[PDB]
Protein: Iron-sulfur cluster assembly scaffold protein NifU
Amino acid sequence: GSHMIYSEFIMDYSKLKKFHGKIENAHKVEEGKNLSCGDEVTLYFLFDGDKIVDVKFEGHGCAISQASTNVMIEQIIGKTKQEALEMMKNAENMMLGKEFDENVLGPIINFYDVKNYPMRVKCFLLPWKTLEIALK
Amino acid sequence: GSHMIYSEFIMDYSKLKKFHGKIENAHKVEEGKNLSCGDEVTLYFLFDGDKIVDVKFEGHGCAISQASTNVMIEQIIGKTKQEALEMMKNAENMMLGKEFDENVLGPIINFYDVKNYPMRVKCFLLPWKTLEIALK
Ligand code: NI
Ligand code: NI
Ligand code: NI
Ligand code: NI
Ligand code: NI
Ligand code: NI
Ligand SMILES: [Zn+2]
Ligand SMILES: [Zn+2]
Structure:
C-alpha cells in the first residue's frame, strides 16, 4: 500500500553482509548521515594509487540506503577513483531526471524507480555522496 | 518474486526510531544474534518491580528482525514480566504450527505469514527469544 518501493532487488541487496565491517588502517574513512530519515554509513577504503582496492561500510539505515551502499561497493571495487566518480555523477543524474549513461551504471539502474519517491532519493544518494566527498 | 514477505506493516515497523538506543543504568541488558541471517539485537530494560517501564534496543538487522523488535517493544511496555512472557510464548506458538491466543498477540498477528519461511522465522523470533532469556 505504500511500501511498493521495496523490490526484490532492493531487499536482496539490503541484507547482503559481505561488505559490512571496518577495514583496519583504512587509507580513508568517511561518515555520512541522511538525518531526514535517520540513515548513517561509514565507508572504509583501501586504494592502490588511483585504484579502489577494497571498500567496506559500517552503520545502518533503511533498506534503500543499505541496498544502495552494497550495489555501490560491488560496482566500484577494482575501479579507479575517476571511474567511481563518473559512476557517482551518473547515479545522481539518474535521480535528478537529467541524462545518464546506462552502460556506466549497470545494475545501479535497478534504483531508477526510487526517483518516484522524492524523500527516498536521499536514502539512495547517501553512500554516493559519501563516496564523492571521500574521493576528493 | 521473494519480496512478498515484506508487507507494508513490516516495512513501516522496521524503520521505527522511537525505541532504538540505549538506556543508561538499565536494570537489564541482553544481547542476541541470528547468525544464519546476520541480525543483532541488544535489549535495554527498566522495570518497576514486575512492571516493564521502558525498553530500547541497539544493533541492527533485517527488516523482519527490526520490525519484530519494534512491535514487541511497543506491545510489552507497561505490561508485567509474566504478561510479556505469555505474549512471547504465544508468538513462538504462532511460528511453529501450534495454537495461540489472538487477543494476547494483537498486532503481533501481522507476522503470521513469516511462519511459511523457516529461515525468516529466526528473524521474527530473535527479539522474543532474547526477551525470554532477559526476563528469566
Ligand atoms: Ni505499501
Ligand atoms: Ni553491523
Ligand atoms: Ni573526508
Ligand atoms: Ni518478491
Ligand atoms: Ni543505530
Ligand atoms: Ni542475561
Ligand atoms: Zn533512508
Ligand atoms: Zn534476519
Notes: Chain B touches chain A at residues 1-3, 6-8, 11-12, 14-15, 17, 37-38, 60, 62-63 (CB under 8 Å). Chain B has one domain: 1-136.
